Each structure stands twice: as C-alpha cells, then as structure tokens.
Amino acid sequence: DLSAASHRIPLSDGNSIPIIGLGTYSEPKSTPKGACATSVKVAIDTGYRHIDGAYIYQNEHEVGEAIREKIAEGKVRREDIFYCGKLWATNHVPEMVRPTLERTLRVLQLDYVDLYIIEVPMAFKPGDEIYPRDENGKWLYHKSNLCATWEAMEACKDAGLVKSLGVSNFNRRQLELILNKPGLKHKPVSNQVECHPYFTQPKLLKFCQQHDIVITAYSPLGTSRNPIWVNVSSPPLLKDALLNSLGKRYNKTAAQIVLRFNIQRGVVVIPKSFNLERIKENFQIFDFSLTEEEMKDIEALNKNVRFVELLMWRDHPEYPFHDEY
Numbered sequence: 079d080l081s082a083a084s085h086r087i088p089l090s091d092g093n094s095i096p097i098i099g100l101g102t103y104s105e106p107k108s109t110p111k112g113a114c115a116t117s118v119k120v121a122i123d124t125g126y127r128h129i130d131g132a133y134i135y136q137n138e139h140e141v142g143e144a145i146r147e148k149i150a151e152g153k154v155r156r157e158d159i160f161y162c163g164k165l166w167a168t169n170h171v172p173e174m175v176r177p178t179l180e181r182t183l184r185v186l187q188l189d190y191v192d193l194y195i196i197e198v199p200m201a202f203k204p205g206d207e208i209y210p211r212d213e214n215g216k217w218l219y220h221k222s223n224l225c226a227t228w229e230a231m232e233a234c235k236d237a238g239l240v241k242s243l244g245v246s247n248f249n250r251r252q253l254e255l256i257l258n259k260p261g262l263k264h265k266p267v268s269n270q271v272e273c274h275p276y277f278t279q280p281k282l283l284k285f286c287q288q289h290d291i292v293i294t295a296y297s298p299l300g301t302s303r304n305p306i307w308v309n310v311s312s313p314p315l316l317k318d319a320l321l322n323s324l325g326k327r328y329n330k331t332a333a334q335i336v337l338r339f340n341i342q343r344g345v346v347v348i349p350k351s352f353n354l355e356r357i358k359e360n361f362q363i364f365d366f367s368l369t370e371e372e373m374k375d376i377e378a379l380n381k382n383v384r385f386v387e388l389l390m391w392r393d394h395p396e397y398p399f400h401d402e403y
C-alpha cells in the first residue's frame with residue numbers, strides 16, 4: 079500500500095502525514111552551517127515530503143531556505159510538503175503561543191506549518207533563554223496549564239497559521255487532560271515520542287490509536303548517542319543481533335529494518351541524517367516488508383529503557399516519564 083511515491087497516512091482532522099520524514103536536529107557546535115539546508119534539499123530530491131524541525135534546533139531558517147528553493151524550482155508545490163514545528167517550554171503562556179508560531183513562520187518565510195506541536199508538557203520560565211535557571215543552577219519552572227496552552231494552539235489553527243495540531247512527550251494523563259477538555263475544538267492528531275525496537279511504546283500506541291492519534295517516532299534509529307543527554311545504558315540499537323540478521327535476509331541495513339518496522343505498524347518515522355548516503359538509505363523502505371513473525375520478534379526486542387530520559391527535569395510537575403505511559 080505504501081510506496082516511495084505515495085506514503086501519506088490519514089490524520090483525524092482530514093489532513094494526511096507522510097509516514098517517513100527527515101529529522102533535523104543536530105548539535106549546533108559540531109554541525110557545519112548549511113548542512114541542514116543541503117540535507118533537506120537532498121531529502122526532497124530523494125523523495126521525502128515530510129520534514130521535522132523546531133525553532134530551538136537553531137536551523138529553522140535553513141529548513142525554510144531548502145523548502146522554498148525546492149518550491150521555487152518546481153520540484154514540489156507547498157501543498158506537497160509537510161513541515162512540523164514545535165512550541166518549546168518557555169513559550170507555553172497562552173499569550174505567547176501565537177507570537178511564537180508567527181516567529182517560526184517568519185523564520186521559515188512560509189504562510190503556515192503543516193503540524194505545530196507542544197514540544198514538551200513541561201512549562202519553563204518565560205524569557206529569552208530556552209533553559210531558565212538561577213545562579214544556583216536550579217531550573218526555573220513555570221506552572222503548566224496545558225488546557226489553556228492548547229486553546230491558544232487552537233486559535234492558531236482557526237487563524238489558518240497551521241493545518242494540524244499535536245503534542246510531543248505527552249503521557250496518557252496529559253493526553254486525557256486535553257482529550258476531555260470542556261469545549262475541545264481541535265483534538266491533537268499526533269503525539270511525537272521516542273519509539274524504536276528498544277522502546278516500542280506498546281501501551282501508549284494502543285491508547286493513541288484508540289483516540290485516532292497517530293504516533294510519530296522520534297529518535298527512530300536510537301539517537302546519535304550523545305552522552306550529554308543520551309542514556310547510553312543500552313547498547314547501540316543499530317548493532318543489535320536480530321536487527322542485523324534480518325537485514326541480511328532482505329539485503330537491508332539494521333536502520334532500514336527498524337524504520338520499516340515502525341511504518342509497517344502505522345507509526346510515522348522521522349530519522350535524522352545530514353549524510354548524503356544515509357539520507358537515501360533511510361528512504362529505501364518501501365520495496366520490502368517484514369513478516370508477521372519478524373514483526374513480532376522485532377517488537378519482542380523492547381527493553382522499556384529510554385535513550386531520552388531528560389532526567390534533569392524529572393522534578394518538574396509535568397515530567398512525563400514517571401507514569402508507566
């Protein structure tokens with residue numbers, strides 16, 4: 079059903095989202111300028127029609143530069159491109175939601191984004207710094223009011239600034255808080271969370287599917303394993319015995335195996351790569367399919383261990399990882 083030329087899956091609001099997209103986060107200090115723009119351009123030439131980014135990644139202007147150039151030359155129309163932006167923790171005050179989205183539209187130099195999501199359920203001290211802390215290093219938190227923040231996101235869709243609304247790093251409770259909100263206008267159509275063979279999100283996936291919420295697997299390849307924030311407790315996902323074994327069977331890499339695993343179960347994948355060859359490799363997942371037995375053996379690889387714990391904020395009231403899901 080899913081092909082390189084056509085792999086968009088339905089969202090509950092009547093829109094659709096390409097099942098594979100290009101992630102664009104890259105460590106600022108160790109990433110050449112223009113690398114994100116080049117990659118987005120290569121991704122689009124390869125066949126990607128979905129790009130995942132965020133203002134705090136500090137390269138949203140490069141993302142816009144690439145999309146606009148590809149539109150300019152006629153490689154794609156704006157409508158063929160799906161861009162997802164994110165609302166960071168220091169911008170959850172209702173009055174700041176729209177101005178924050180507008181800044182991103184100005185950075186991208188686009189009239190709207192296809193998907194705008196609350197980046198994390200935790201609210202931080204409003205200001206310039208994206209990581210608020212006093213002289214003692216104590217993180218400056220802000221009282222979260224997801225319901226209020228959501229109503230402001232809704233107003234943004236009403237103004238035509240965004241086609242779909244969603245969330246990221248939200249547990250069942252935080253999702254319910256919105257899904258049961260009195261007078262809910264636009265339900266979240268997506269929840270972007272860590273998801274791969276080592277963290278399959280079995281219960282959260284069921285919950286979301288139950289409410290017609292599509293899951294977007296971030297860090298679908300198990301992260302770049304940067305110790306600054308990545309829990310390296312688990313061995314490299316792409317070095318996994320079974321994943322590499324199955325790869326040989328289909329003459330595919332473990333990366334292609336894990337990506338295929340998620341899209342075959344209806345989970346959107348947004349693998350990040352700024353490497354010409356790997357960008358292409360990750361897209362070649364429509365010419366084969368895993369058997370029901372292999373799908374089961376891969377799912378059986380789950381360890382219930384996150385590569386992204388965000389432990390520095392485990393004391394925040396809205397930390398999403400205490401609950402079982």
Ligand SMILES: NC(=O)c1ccc[n+]([C@@H]2O[C@H](COP(=O)([O-])OP(=O)(O)OC[C@H]3O[C@@H](n4cnc5c(N)ncnc54)[C@H](OP(=O)(O)O)[C@@H]3O)[C@@H](O)[C@H]2O)c1
Binds near residue numbers: 247297299331334
């Ligand atoms: N919303 C959130 O809270 C959140 C959190 C984390 C990530 N995300 C989003 O999800 C995207 C994906 O996640 P992520 O960047 O953390 O991780 P990832 O996509 O799981 O892995 C990326 C790492 O894998 C390498 N890689 C890419 N393709 C590869 C292949 N075929 N074989 C071997 N290595 C490969 C990349 O290096 P090269 O670039 O050199 O190929 C990079 O070091 C982000 O970039 C971002 O758009 C969202």
